[PDB]
Enzyme design. Structure first.
Site, short mmCIF file in Angstrom:
data_model
loop_
_atom_site.label_atom_id
_atom_site.label_comp_id
_atom_site.label_asym_id
_atom_site.label_seq_id
_atom_site.Cartn_x
_atom_site.Cartn_y
_atom_site.Cartn_z
N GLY A 148 0.77 -1.25 0.00
CA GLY A 148 0.00 0.00 0.00
C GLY A 148 0.80 1.30 0.00
N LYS A 179 -0.56 2.54 -4.01
CA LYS A 179 -1.12 3.89 -4.20
C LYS A 179 -0.96 4.43 -5.61
CE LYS A 179 -2.82 5.58 -0.16
NZ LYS A 179 -2.89 4.20 0.43
N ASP A 259 -6.13 8.91 3.47
CA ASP A 259 -5.46 10.03 2.79
C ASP A 259 -6.33 10.85 1.84
OD1 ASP A 259 -2.10 8.55 2.30
OD2 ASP A 259 -3.20 9.01 4.12
N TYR A 296 -7.63 6.67 10.59
CA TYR A 296 -7.17 5.29 10.74
C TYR A 296 -6.08 5.12 11.81
CZ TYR A 296 -3.71 7.22 7.79
OH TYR A 296 -2.74 8.08 7.26
N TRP A 355 -2.88 -2.35 9.86
CA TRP A 355 -2.01 -1.95 8.77
C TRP A 355 -0.75 -1.32 9.40
CZ3 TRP A 355 -3.73 0.14 3.53
CH2 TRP A 355 -2.67 0.82 2.89
N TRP A 356 0.35 -2.04 9.40
CA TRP A 356 1.50 -1.59 10.16
C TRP A 356 2.49 -0.93 9.23
CZ3 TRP A 356 2.77 0.05 14.57
CH2 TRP A 356 4.10 0.01 15.03
N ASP A 362 8.38 5.08 2.08
CA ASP A 362 7.96 6.09 1.11
C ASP A 362 8.03 7.53 1.62
OD1 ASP A 362 5.67 6.22 2.74
OD2 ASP A 362 4.36 5.26 1.31
C1 LIG Z 1 -3.53 3.21 6.85
C2 LIG Z 1 -3.42 3.93 5.52
C3 LIG Z 1 -2.03 4.54 5.20
O1 LIG Z 1 -1.03 4.42 5.92
N1 LIG Z 1 -2.03 5.20 4.06
C4 LIG Z 1 -0.82 5.86 3.54
C5 LIG Z 1 -0.22 6.91 4.48
N2 LIG Z 1 -0.72 8.05 4.89
C6 LIG Z 1 0.17 8.65 5.64
C7 LIG Z 1 -0.07 10.00 6.35
C8 LIG Z 1 -0.65 11.00 5.36
C9 LIG Z 1 0.41 11.60 4.42
C10 LIG Z 1 0.39 11.28 3.05
C11 LIG Z 1 1.33 11.86 2.20
C12 LIG Z 1 2.27 12.74 2.73
C13 LIG Z 1 2.31 13.06 4.08
C14 LIG Z 1 1.37 12.48 4.93
C15 LIG Z 1 1.28 7.90 5.72
N3 LIG Z 1 1.08 6.82 5.00
C16 LIG Z 1 1.92 5.66 4.69
C17 LIG Z 1 3.38 5.97 5.07
O2 LIG Z 1 3.89 6.95 4.19
C18 LIG Z 1 1.63 5.37 3.22
O3 LIG Z 1 2.50 4.37 2.69
C19 LIG Z 1 0.20 4.82 3.13
O4 LIG Z 1 -0.13 4.47 1.81
#
Ligand SMILES: CCC(=O)N[C@H]1c2[nH]c(CCc3ccccc3)c[n+]2[C@H](CO)[C@@H](O)[C@@H]1O
Ligand SMILES: [Cl-]
Ligand SMILES: [Cl-]
Ligand code: NA
Length: 584
Positions: A148, A179, A259, A296, A355-356, A362
């Protein structure tokens, strides 16, 4: 004569009740006819690969391998087991006993047989096996990966290789949700063209063969319409989408609301409820729907011990039969304490899914996350029945952390993170394991310096040694013995990294060559930092000279895209530069 080999996961019950014995050029095959289809093809492949023939009929003297369920009902199995049974265990449970000559494998269901084979595969070394009595079964029923992350999605080969790797470590869940797959999200309404579709079919096929639930995720939340004909047209796109993946063999689905800006709790849940009714239930052989709500993580879901407005309405609208995923106390956080899971599970009145977000990188790509599951409560299973990790876009290096997640989620109670980590690198890297540990031990902690942090501290023992050095020098006590020991550490960091560069398989090297060079640079600045110090001997010349080097090494590391050992190897250099030892 003869020891048990590293096993992953750690089986629930295992004891040595024999000296083990060699398996012959040729074994006796009993049960292939009844036993699970997939458990058998995995056996034949292992057998092939290892110069081990299947007897067209008995003896001699052949080693005796016997396999099947408990439904399945065979005579040799029972005598073989001779006291042990997989009759009273969870789904995916099995038994294995290697009795001098004999090897007996029965799982409760086809799943557990397959896993029994995986444990066999790990037990045999050269033809030698240990004598052991094993009963085994998972702590948590759903264990796996959610692809993800943001960034380049895993290639199609990456995925097949992960899916095989998952079977072998008893992980049973792979959630498909990159994504940046346009069709997953940015263009979620749209059918996969012909050739992605062709490629998608192999993922599915490969998954069933390794007893992996392939879960098809979709993320319509950026632009989905809820009201009137607009909502009909859009909800139908969801169906169209799920149907095509159903008509390819997919029996699990996820719908994700993370997001996005739209916080229409009621509408999200209604889309999910509709899909539960109109698709999931109308099909009868589709596993529970999985979702992530736009809130979440506990910080986003809760205030003052109570749900927030969105979470409250989500919680009360969404059907009990739906799996809800949360990330823990934060999006990327240190721990999930039992108390956090209790809290979240209360609000949704269910066992929760996790979802860990580790080892995903990224949000800070310069660093590889190479550490074990860390900070997750060892009694989480009380409130959680579905555990997945979000990995790095780097498939191969992700395996180390995933390996540990397999042991955490399968045998939660006995999970030891340091032993799991060592096992993982030992099992994955072989002759290079020791050098790989040196490197990876410096790349476990993730921290983007703001909202995102998780993982074991980097090189903790080195960091304590660095601390002691500073305590002895600020005290003005002799530290030449420690100084000497740190020279050996820094030299050994550079030695291991060079060995990694020249000998790593390419599939792994291409994912870490930059970080390897980063740790070499810091090891050299570390070493120059020590010189800087020894130069104690009021040698101004050697001091200025070792200082310009330590400073150059640091600056190279700071400038480089690769990030490693921030609080240890890198920080040590800044600590050394600021330790003013020229005062009188
Ligand atoms: C539980 C859903 C989740 O973690 N969605 C994304 C998610 N959302 C977020 C916080 C929102 C965010 C998105 C983009 C840039 C800064 C913060 C952080 N992450 C992970 C770690 O980067 C991504 O890999 C995930 O795809
Ligand atoms: Cl709307
Ligand atoms: Cl850097
Ligand atoms: Na439940």
């Amino acid at each position: 004569q003869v020891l048990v080999p590293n096993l992953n996961p750690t089986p629930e019950n295992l004891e040595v009740v024999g000296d083990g014995f060699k398996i012959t050029s040729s074994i006796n095959l009993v049960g292939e006819e009844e036993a699970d289809e997939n458990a058998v093809n995995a056996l034949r492949e292992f057998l092939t690969a290892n110069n081990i023939e299947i007897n067209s009929e008995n003896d001699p003297n052949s080693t005796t391998l016997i396999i099947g369920e408990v439904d399945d009902d065979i005579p040799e199995l029972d005598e073989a087991l001779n006291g042990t049974t997989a009759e009273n265990l969870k789904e995916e449970g099995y038994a294995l006993v290697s009795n001098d000559g004999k090897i007996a494998i029965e799982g409760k269901d086809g799943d557990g047989t397959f896993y029994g084979v995986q444990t066999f595969k790990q037990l045999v070394k050269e033809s030698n096996i240990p004598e052991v009595n094993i009963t085994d079964y998972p702590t948590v029923s759903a264990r796996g990966i959610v692809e993800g992350f943001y960034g380049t999605p895993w290639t199609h080969q990456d995925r097949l290789d992960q899916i095989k790797f998952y079977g072998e470590n008893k992980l049973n869940t792979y959630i498909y949700a990159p994504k940046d797959d346009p069709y997953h999200r940015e263009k979620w309404r749209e059918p996969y063209p012909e050739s992605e579709m062709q490629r998608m079919q192999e993922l599915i096929n490969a998954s069933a063969e390794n007893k992996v639930d392939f879960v098809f995720g979709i993320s319509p939340g950026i632009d989905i319409r809820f009201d009137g004909d607009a909502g009909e047209e859009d909800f139908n796109h969801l169906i169209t989408k799920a149907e095509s993946l159903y008509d390819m063999g997919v029996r699990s689905f996820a719908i994700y609301w993370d997001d996005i800006q739209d916080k229409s709790a009621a509408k999200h849940a209604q889309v999910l409820n509709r899909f539960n009714e109109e698709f999931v239930k109308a099909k009868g052989d589709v596993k529970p729907l999985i979702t992530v709500p736009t809130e979440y993580d506990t910080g986003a879901m809760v205030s003052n011990g109570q749900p927030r407005a969105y979470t409250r309405i989500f919680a009360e609208t969404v059907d009990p039969s739906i799996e809800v995923m949360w990330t823990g106390p934060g999006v990327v956080t240190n721990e999930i304490p039992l108390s956090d899971a209790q809290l979240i599970s209360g609000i949704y009145d269910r066992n929760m899914a996790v979802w860990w977000n580790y080892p995903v990188t990224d949000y800070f790509k310069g660093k590889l996350a190479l550490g074990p599951m860390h900070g997750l409560d060892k009694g989480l299973n009380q409130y959680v029945d579905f555990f997945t990790v979000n990995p790095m876009e780097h498939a191969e290096l992700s395996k180390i952390s995933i390996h540990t997640a397999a042991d955490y989620s399968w045998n939660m109670d006995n999970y030891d993170y340091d032993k799991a980590w060592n096992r993982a690198i030992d099992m994955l890297y072989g002759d290079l394991a020791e050098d790989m540990k040196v490197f990876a031990n410096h790349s476990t902690r993730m921290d983007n310096k703001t909202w995102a942090k998780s993982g074991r501290e980097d090189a903790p023992e080195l960091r304590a040694k660095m601390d002691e050095l500073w305590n002895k020098l600020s005290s003005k006590e002799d530290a030449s013995a420690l100084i000497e020991e740190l020279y050996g550490e820094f030299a050994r960091m550079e030695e291991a990294c060079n060995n990694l560069k020249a000998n790593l398989p390419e599939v792994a090297l291409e994912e870490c060559s930059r970080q390897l060079d980063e740790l070499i640079t810091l090891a050299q600045g570390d070493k120059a930092s020590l010189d800087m110090i020894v130069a104690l001997n009021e040698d101004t010349e050697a001091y200025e000279s070792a200082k310009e080097i330590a400073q150059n090494k640091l600056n190279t590391a700071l400038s480089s895209f690769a990030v490693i050992s921030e609080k240890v190897a890198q920080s040590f250099i800044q600590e050394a530069l600021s330790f003013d030892l020229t005062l009188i």
